[PDB]
Amino acid sequence: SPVQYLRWGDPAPIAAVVFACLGLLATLFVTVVFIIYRDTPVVKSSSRELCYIILAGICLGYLCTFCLIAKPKQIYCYLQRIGIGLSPAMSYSALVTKTYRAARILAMSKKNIFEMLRIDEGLRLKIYKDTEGYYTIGIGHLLTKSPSLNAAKSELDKAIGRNTNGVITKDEAEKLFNQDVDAAVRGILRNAKLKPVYDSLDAVRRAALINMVFQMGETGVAGFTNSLRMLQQKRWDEAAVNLAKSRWYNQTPNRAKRVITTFRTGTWDAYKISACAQLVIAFILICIQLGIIVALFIMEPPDIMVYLICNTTNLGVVAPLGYNGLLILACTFYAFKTRNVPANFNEAKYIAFTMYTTCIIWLAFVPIYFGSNYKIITMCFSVSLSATVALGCMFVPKVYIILAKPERN
Ligand SMILES: COC(=O)N1CC[C@@H]2[C@H]1CCC[C@@]2(O)C#Cc1cccc(C)c1
Ligand SMILES: CCCCCCCC/C=C\CCCCCCCC(=O)O
């Protein structure tokens, strides 16, 4: 009885239970909310099936302490290992597919703007110089500022990752372009006249704005004061008419006509320019962790050594800890890639933050747990902590909006 130890002077098992109980209630609350309001845009805009898997993984995470703190039976030693291993696996391996999808979608987004400026501005598959004599390649991508032709080739190989000999491909030129796009966005966000307009526009209309920036510069686009205001107020037809009078339109009519049209419709008409799969992939990554656990049940049969001490060795912990580490490492990679993506009510910002802490939690777990003389309690807190973080950062801000701010919804 957890009360006995609490009264004998040890509040560790009673605390882990309360922690686990409060966690289960919290997870139960969140899921029910997502069920009732499943049709609300804040729940509809994300993969609902994946969230259910993440919420299920966290629930088992809290249930883990009930196997770590239990009456000494044989199967509880089984439930411990199958729980501490699979519960993070259910959460992170479903979260990686979510982030990976968000990474491909973003990459495909940068693909369109690349094809846009390839048509509007052009491209060179070998090294050249700009109007100021500096070595350049691709779509106006500066390589270096030294007169050395050798210097440019060195910088190119480091950027591409191979011996290019001053020659690249379309795909490699897009890579260099992605950098210049991000740099352009950085400048726009730091420009007081361009920032409000950029924030109001959709994905397509933002590319048309960056198009203008790459032609005239920031200090040039800011000259379209009246037109920029029209775009911000979503008055497309008035913006197009106003832009068609500019010196910019009369100087480069062929290109300007396409950019203006993109502001109009918010489509790529001027330019020639899966859910079920995610569940299967998530299922596969979970079964891999299960195969590891089942194998270790065979290699090293679990046996009983309030506290339930089992005979689980290092290898019985290290292997599923390492696999979970990869799931975490992969998630962070894609989450950091999509950290600024505003889809789903700035969802990804919260996702990235969770993966930052989880890496610290995982990294801290290794020296702490393996140097500890109180392993069971340190395993209870560790699992309940990283489960709480994933619940507090990813789900709570969505529950808040859904219950406290239904108008925002
Ligand atoms: C075999 O041991 C492990 O693989 N680990 C030991 C501790 C545990 C895990 C790896 C990452 C950190 C951890 O503390 C956790 C977790 C967790 C559980 C359920 C839901 C969520 C979102 C996270
Ligand atoms: C942020 C997480 C990224 C790191 C993932 C790296 C994966 C490495 C795999 C396994 C490392 C497990 C460490 C176990 C060392 C054994 C210590 C001991 O025996 O006491």
Account of the 3D structure:
By secondary structure, the chain is mainly α. The chain has two domains: 248 residues, no CATH class; 161 residues, Lysozyme (Orthogonal Bundle). Helices cover 73% and strands 2% of the residues. It contains 20 helices and three strands. Strands 1-2-3 form a three-stranded antiparallel β-sheet. Strand 1 and strand 2 form a beta hairpin. The radius of gyration is 27 Å and the shape is elongated. The two termini are 46 Å apart. The chain binds Mavoglurant (2U8) and oleic acid. Oleic acid binds next to helix 17 and helix 18.
Name a few traits of the molecule.
about 400 residues; mainly alpha; Lysozyme; 2 domains; 3-stranded antiparallel sheet; 3 strands; elongated; binds Mavoglurant; binds oleic acid; Metabotropic glutamate receptor 5
- Return the string of H and E elements: HHHHHHEEEHHHHHHHHHHHHHH
In which order are the strands of the major sheet placed?
Answer: 1-2-3
How many strand segments? 3
C-alpha geometry: elongated
Classify the beta-strand content into a percent band.
under 5%
Largest sheet: 3 strands, antiparallel
Task: Count up the domains.
Answer: 2
- The rounded Rg comes to 27 Å
Helix-residue proportion: over 70%
State the separation between the terminal residues, measured CA to CA: 46 Å
- Summing up helix and strand content along with how strands pair, one would put the structural category as mainly alpha
Q: Which ligands accompany this protein?
A: Mavoglurant, oleic acid
The number of helical segments is 20
PDB class: membrane protein
Keywords: 7TM, receptor, G-protein, cysteine-S-acetamide, membrane protein
Assembly: monomeric
Entry title: Structure of the human class C GPCR metabotropic glutamate receptor 5 transmembrane domain in complex with the negative allosteric modulator mavoglurant
